[PDB]
Structure formats: C-alpha cells, structure tokens
Amino acid sequence: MAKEFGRPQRVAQEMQKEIALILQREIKDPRLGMMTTVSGVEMSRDLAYAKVYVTFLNDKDEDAVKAGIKALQEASGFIRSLLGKAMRLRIVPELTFFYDNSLVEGMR
C-alpha cells in the first residue's frame, strides 16, 4: 500500500488498502480485541481467483482462535461479497481468506 505506478502493483495496492481496510473494518477486529494484519495479498483477474492473507493474534486463545476464525469463516462469503459490492466490480474472483494466526506458527 504505497506504490503509485502504472504497473500491476499500483492497482494491487489500492486494492490491498481497500481490502485491508474492509478486512480491518468490516471484519471483527474490535470484536476480537485485537488488530489483524495483511502480510499477503493475491488478486488474479486473469480468470476469477484471488488469495488474501490475514494474520491475527487470536492464537492467544485457542477458543477465540477456533471460534473467532469460525466467525471469519462464516463471514467469508460476506467479506468477499461485501468487497465486490463495496468495490462494485465484476471480476468477483475467488478471493479466498487465509487466516495465518500464531496458532499455526506461534510467530504470527
């Protein structure tokens, strides 16, 4: 989020910031009394598939990590649909939501 160019990086940024926001706003950040991060972003419009990364500190509690993630899982199609609509687009690529917490690395 800081690449104002004509390359595929610029758009990737604007989108990363837009998704990062809706990913930190539309998401349950305040509900998890924790701040999430986006140490990964992938947008493939060549067909209709994307892959976004989100790291949380839910690891702190396996209960909040399991349940929490469960909430992020159910709100999956919600974030994806909320995005497409939020950005009124069409590509509506399979932008999956990868949750990389500290419960799968311990350093997230």
UniProtKB/Swiss-Prot annotation:
The keyword Cell inner membrane does not apply. Keywords: Cytoplasm, Ribosome biogenesis, Stress response. Its main location: cytoplasm. Disulfide bonds: none annotated. GO terms for cellular component: cytosol. The C-terminus (residues 109-133) is required for stable association with the 30S ribosomal subunit in vitro. This is 30S ribosome-binding factor. The gene is rbfA. The chain holds residues 1 to 108 of 133 of the full protein.
